[PDB]
Amino acid sequence: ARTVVLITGCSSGIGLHLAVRLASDPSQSFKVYATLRDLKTQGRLWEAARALACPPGSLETLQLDVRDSKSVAAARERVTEGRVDVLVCNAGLGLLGPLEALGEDAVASVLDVNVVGTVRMLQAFLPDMKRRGSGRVLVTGSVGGLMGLPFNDVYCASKFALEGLCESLAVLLLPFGVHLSLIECGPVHTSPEEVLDRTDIHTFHRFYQYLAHSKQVFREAAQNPEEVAEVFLTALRAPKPTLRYFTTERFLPLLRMRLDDPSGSNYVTAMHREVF
Amino acid sequence: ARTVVLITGCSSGIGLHLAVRLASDPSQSFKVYATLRDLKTQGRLWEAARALACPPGSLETLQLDVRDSKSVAAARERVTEGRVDVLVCNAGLGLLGPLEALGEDAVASVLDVNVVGTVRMLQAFLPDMKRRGSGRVLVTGSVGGLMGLPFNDVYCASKFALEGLCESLAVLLLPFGVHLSLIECGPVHTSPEEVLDRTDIHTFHRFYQYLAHSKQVFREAAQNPEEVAEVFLTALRAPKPTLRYFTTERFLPLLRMRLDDPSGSNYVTAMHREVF
Ligand SMILES: C[C@]12CC[C@@H]3c4ccc(O)cc4CC[C@H]3[C@@H]1CCC2=O
């Protein structure tokens, strides 16, 4: 049949726009299972594939709570072609704030969702692909998994993790014929008493400047889901794909400053200059 | 008054050797609180204490379980001096196997201990260090935080995360007079049924091949913890502390060839060759 594709975080954003893109393909090439934590909020999504003349059943919607591996497992059992050719690990959470401000539950949910959720998926699906000797797996990365961002300490922790996880696997799955690629996004588009009370005067100031500077870079350089979604195809279709794919070239310079000096000294100074 | 040092995971290895090295420094500069998950395992440490002759009072132990933020606050409370000049986030866990063989609680145990653990510590101790405008935090890093290694997927994920968490904080922490540095360690000194069934046959061979090479490399490469602890010392004293310190040159060129190929596929082969 088609190349089967299962994707996570299809509610809003990237996962949504990529789900529709592959379903609607001029080839009719890819059967898509989009997955959602609330199956109800698939309103957003079904319009923009009815909208695009997505052929007889090119888009299926399953419920997948990445925090829970029974839910991951039901989802595999209810993929009735009994393979996956393309796995997209996209669900993710952000956590912005001063570290000592952040709720412990919030900290663990970001890890559980960003990192462990992705481990569940690869646990559930990855054996089948190795059994076979082909399969592709695509993980929504972040430039914040590649370099550290003030006040995104955990989010970044969480995306560095994915790199770690994916790079280690990649090394093992070289001779197996299974392929693994990270898609590294810059930004993309879709308390003050409390903050002060849970930190100090100096951090509070730095948080709000970071925010201004952040809102700024968002407006000069935030990409849109469908662009990002293109880089996924570019890597699906790739004959022999690479471990990474960058969506913009805009942070190659800051990155090269980090790769220049492993002591980390140049990068810390730079990025602090950049931000404040 | 002495420099107040608080160190997690002093049961053994690096943190045991670091706590005693500091307690017995001829300067008698250091007041060390050596923490352990379980107080019953503090024997080797005390053998080691009077053995290097740490003076009376240079060393006390505390129970501290980095999984539990109440255990973190109880400990912080036992710092009689009411301040911490040097924090050493060293507690750590390993996890070695095919990803799909690893169990769910284990996978999470590691993140919770290696990553969240370090967050709780930093959450409970950075506030005072920022108020004072002084403080050093040292974090036990790994080769596996810098480059992925087959069959250490979750281990490396948890160590990539510290790189992330640490770098992001360091970008914020530079105007505050609080220094955070990572001590990047290579290897350091001090069922098969189950594994076959939870994975495929070719993986199985690759695992005991890895293991063979991994024991192979622990004989040609493993440093004394004495050597490693001296690197922590150097970082502590350094007037201009950099974000990373490496205890060895060995793996630096794998790190370089990793760094100048952002695509990542050179590193991937390089490491596969190295290993199999
Ligand atoms: C830190 C940053 C603002 C916030 C950006 C940000 C925030 C969230 C995210 O998922 C990705 C990115 C891309 C890089 C970040 C910028 C680099 C230069 C700058 O000032």
Curated annotation (Swiss-Prot), chains A, B:
It is found in: Cytoplasm. It comes from the Eukaryota. The modification Phosphoserine is found at residue 134. Its EC number is 1.1.1.51, 1.1.1.62. The keyword Calcium does not apply. Changing residue 274 to Q: No effect on conversion of estrone to 17beta-estradiol. One of its GO terms (cellular component) is cytoplasm. NADP(+) binds at residues 9-37, 65, 159. CDD domains: type1_17beta-HSD-like_SDR_c. The active site is at residue 155. Homodimer. Exists predominantly as a homodimer but also exits as monomer. This is 17-beta-hydroxysteroid dehydrogenase type 1. It comes from Homo sapiens (Human). The lineage of its organism: Eukaryota, Metazoa, Chordata, Craniata, Vertebrata.
